Paper text:
The [name] scaffold is built on a four-helix bundle from apolipoprotein E3. The two helixes used to display the CONE 2 residues were well matched to the α2 helix in terms of the Cα-Cβ orientations. For instance, a discontinuous three β-strand motif was grafted onto CONE 1 scaffolds, while the two helixes on the CONE 2 and scaffold 5 design ([name], a similar nomenclature is followed for all designed proteins) displayed the α2 helix-specific residues. Comparison with the Env trimer protein revealed a high degree of mimicry: within the epitope region, the Cα RMSDs between the designed proteins and Env were 0.42 Å ([name]) and 0.34 Å (C4S3), respectively, suggesting that our CONE mimetics accurately display the Env residues. The electron density maps revealed that the side chains of the grafted residues were well positioned relative to the computational model. We selected the most stable designs (C1S1, [name], and C4S3) for immunization experiments and further structural analysis. The CONE 1, 2, and 4 proteins were monomeric in solution, while the C5S3 design displayed rapid exchange between monomeric and dimeric states. No [name]-specific antibodies were obtained after immunization with CONE 2 (α2 helix).
As the sole target of neutralizing antibodies, the virion surface protein Env encodes a glycan shield to restrict the antibody access to antigenically conserved sites. Small protein mimics of the CONEs are designed by epitope transplantation and used as immunogens to focus the antibody response. Here we focus our protein design efforts on four CONEs, including the structural elements of β sheet 12/13/22 (CONE 1), α2 helix (CONE 2), loop C (CONE 4), and loop E (CONE 5).
Residue numbers in the entry: 19 to 159
Write the structure that this text describes.
Amino acid sequence: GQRWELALGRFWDYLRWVQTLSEQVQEELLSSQVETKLNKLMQRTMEELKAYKSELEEQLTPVAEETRARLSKELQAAQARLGADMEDVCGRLVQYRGEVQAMLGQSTEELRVRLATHLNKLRQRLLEDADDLQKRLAVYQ
């Protein structure tokens, strides 16, 4: 398991707890603690990923520059897909905080159900985009 995969694993571990939407989660969500921690976990994932990309590129047996730039761009695509998935996670959690803050004490049940439905979809993308990224990195080296 590469460093970036472990970093993504810590992102997953925290996201999974957040999705329970317990009252403890709601506490740390409305205090912006959740969006702060998820942002850091996301950044460390992308940083490790960037550095790990540079690693494989240097150990790559030389090839025609055209293929070199294509595989590079193919990996930036998968790299960008993962990044967008995580950013979207943080976003919907920020949005939820803003909505509750504007709800003046009414029931957040329906908001939490819609949030869970959206996190489940974003979650599905991260599995897919992360898997494709792992495959494209392996064939790389």
